[PDB]
Structures are given as structure tokens and as C-alpha cells.
Amino acid sequence: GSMDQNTTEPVAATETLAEVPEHVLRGLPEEVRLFPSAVDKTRIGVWATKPILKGKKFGPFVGDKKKRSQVKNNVYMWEVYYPNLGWMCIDATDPEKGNWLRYVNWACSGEEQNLFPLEINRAIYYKTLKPIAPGEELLVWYXGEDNPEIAAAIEEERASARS
């Protein structure tokens, strides 16, 4: 053995877990915690602090409804048709209007991605295709039009959402 210890956690950022808007961290998954965006935004980022199982359903993502005219290299945003006004864009990327999901960064190849984009009932859910250990940054991607990370993990959530 000898080589089985745990990887030391990052330190020294600038922003503090206590700094994220109390309302955003307030509606977290099981009991996730905010940790500086040591991932990219190098400010505050959201990480697993509690255990996660494959097929988990975390969300739904606040998602504010605005026109695509906005957005610019983000994730917590998508286009959905409204039976009340037509094809719309849902974006929430702010501390005040954007919850914690707005703090989710990006992955690499389903091996580290912990959350995956899902459109349901004009609502965007974030689901886990793989268990995540407390200390892992929550991340997403898949452009991956109709990739199987999207369908396969969708099936277990939606399929299970029935029988």
C-alpha cells in the first residue's frame, strides 16, 4: 500500500464559503458547500460535500427567462419552447438571480462531470451519471447534442420517475 492517502484540499482563494449569497447556498442539493471557484472563475464555486449516487437529480436550475441576446459562453442556459410565448431562452448567471447551480463549472469527459443538462417541464435539472466524493467540484458539459451521457443518465432519472 503506502500510496492510498487522500489528496490535500486546495487553500488560499480570496472569496469565502460564507461570501456566496446566503440564499444561493441555502437551497443546495443534499448539503453541498461553496468553495472558491478553484475550478475556473477562481472566485466561489460549488463542490460536493456530501455523498452522491448515480442518477441523482439535483436542481432544478433557477433559470431566468430571457432572450438569447444575452448569454456568452455559459451553461446554466438553454432554449425552451413556452406554451405561453414560443421558443425562449432560460438564463440565470448571477448571485441574486442565479442560485448555486449558477456556480457549477465544466468537466472534461463524463469521468469527472458530475452534473448533466436536462430539460423537463420547461425546467432544467442537473443529474449525476456517476457517484461523486465530498470534495469534488460540480461540473457540466455536453455541448454533445444527443450524447448517451445525456440519454443514459436521463433514462435512470426519468425512467425511475415513473415505476
From Swiss-Prot:
Effect of residue 161 to V: Reduced histone methyltransferase activity
Effect of residue 108 to Y: Reduced histone methyltransferase activity
Tissue expression from the record: Highly expressed in retinoblastoma cell lines and in brain tumors. Also expressed in a number of other cell lines and in brain, heart, skeletal muscle, liver and spleen. Isoform 1 is expressed in testis at much higher level than isoform 3.
Subcellular location as annotated: Nucleus
Domain SET: 30-143
Protein task: S-adenosyl-L-methionine-dependent histone methyltransferase that specifically methylates 'Lys-9' of histone H3. May function as a DNA-binding transcription factor. Binds to the macrophage-specific TPA-responsive element (MTE) of the HMOX1 (heme oxygenase 1) gene and may act as a transcriptional activator of this gene.
Family: Belongs to the class V-like SAM-binding methyltransferase superfamily.
Summary of subunit composition and partner proteins: Binds to the retinoblastoma protein (RB). Interacts with GATA3.
Name of protein: PR domain zinc finger protein 2
Species: Homo sapiens
Organism classification: Eukaryota, Metazoa, Chordata, Craniata, Vertebrata
Gene that this sequence comes from: PRDM2
Range of the intact protein held here: 1 to 161 of 1718
